[PDB]
Structure formats: C-alpha cells, structure tokens
Design a protein around this ligand. Structure first.
Ligand SMILES: Nc1nc2c(ncn2[C@@H]2O[C@H](COP(=O)(O)OP(=O)(O)O)[C@@H](O)[C@H]2O)c(=O)[nH]1
Ligand SMILES: [Mg+2]
Length: 172
C-alpha cells in the first residue's frame, strides 16, 4: 500500500532536514539540497510518500497544488521559533483545512535539541521570547484538532521515527 504525506510549515523550521534525516538516517549537515522534492520510505509493508514544500510566502499560490489526495499532513514548527509556532494557527492550519477539510493533521515540533541550548535561549530572551514547551505544543495540537503532537530533532534523530510511524497510523 502507498500513503501520501505532505509536510508544511514556515521556511527554515527544518522540513527538508526532517525528511532527509528520516529517510537517510543522516543529518544533511551544511549542504541541504535546494530542489524541492518528494521522498519515499518503505516501512511495515507500507510505502510512505513524503512531499516537501516551499513554505515561503512567495510560494503561497503554488504550494497547494501538491495537496490533492494527501492522506496526512505534518504541520511543522521550530520549537525555538515562537514565530513559526504562531504561524501554525495564523497560516498553516487555515491553509491546510481550506484545501483538505478532513485530512488528518499531525503537529510536529522540530529542532528539539536546541530547546535547552544556552546560546539559542539567550538570543530568544533578548526578544523577550522563550522556546515552545511540550505543554504549549500539546495545547496547540488540540486547539487545531491535530490527531497527535510530537517533538523531534533531525540533528540527533530523537523522536524522528515516531513522527512517521504516527503519520502512517493516522492512515489505515
Ligand atoms: N540545531 C538544529 N538545526 C536544524 C535541525 N533541523 C534543521 N536545522 C537547520 O535549520 C535550517 C533550515 O533547515 P531546513 O531543513 O532547510 O528547513 P526548511 O526550510 O523547513 O526545509 C538549517 O540551517 C538546518 O541546518 C535540528 O533538528 N537541529
Ligand atoms: Mg526545505
């Protein structure tokens, strides 16, 4: 069987690194491929088709062309970017539900390894911000009726497997 999963969220939340680290078992490091592509993993036996998107505003009109026949969406935000997190409810949930009113959503917080990073915490403090905590993410997930809320690091592959196992379980 074949499942189509689309991954959405602001530019730089780690969407492409999440897909390559998951399917490669390696953080692409300093050269992240720039061609927006679709990837695939066979897991048990299911084929998970993983569609990357261009999350920048410039692509607002073209991006939804990859949405038809999506089985499940990953809405990604960076745990160390409250602006990407606010955009879950400002932008991504309304956009996904406008085109796909009944497709299940999974809310994914990314870059978990930076949550307890001194240098990241300090830079956010000077804008009077703090990383998104687990209770905050879970609250957002039930606000938007996400079937599940998960946190992961593409860099350390902590939590990464569960994201896509849960994506498959939202289908089937
Ligand atoms: N520290 C850390 N950085 C990450 C992680 N995932 C992605 N990044 C970085 O965040 C930036 C954008 O990642 P990318 O996957 O291109 O984001 P996209 O625009 O959402 O596809 C790059 O500088 C990556 O090195 C992570 O789990 N931890
Ligand atoms: Mg990308």
């Amino acid at each position: 069987q074949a499942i189509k999963c689309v991954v959405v969220g602001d530019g730089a939340v780690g969407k492409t690194c999440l897909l390559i680290s998951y399917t490669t078992n390696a953080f692409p490091g300093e050269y992240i491929p720039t061609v927006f592509d679709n990837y695939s993993a066979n897991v048990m036996p299911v084929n998970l088709g993983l569609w990357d998107t261009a999350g920048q505003e410039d692509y607002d009109r073209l991006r939804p062309l990859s949405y038809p026949q999506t089985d499940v969406f990953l809405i990604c935000f960076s745990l160390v970017s409250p602006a990407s997190f606010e955009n879950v409810r400002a932008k991504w949930y309304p956009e996904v539900r406008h085109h796909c009113p009944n497709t299940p959503i999974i809310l994914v917080g990314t870059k978990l390894d930076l949550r307890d990073d001194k240098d990241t915490i300090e830079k956010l403090k000077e804008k009077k911000l703090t990383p998104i905590t687990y209770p905050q993410g879970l609250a957002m997930a039930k606000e938007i009726g996400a079937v599940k809320y998960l946190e992961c690091s593409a860099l350390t592959q902590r939590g990464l497997k569960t994201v896509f196992d849960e994506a498959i379980r939202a289908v089937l």
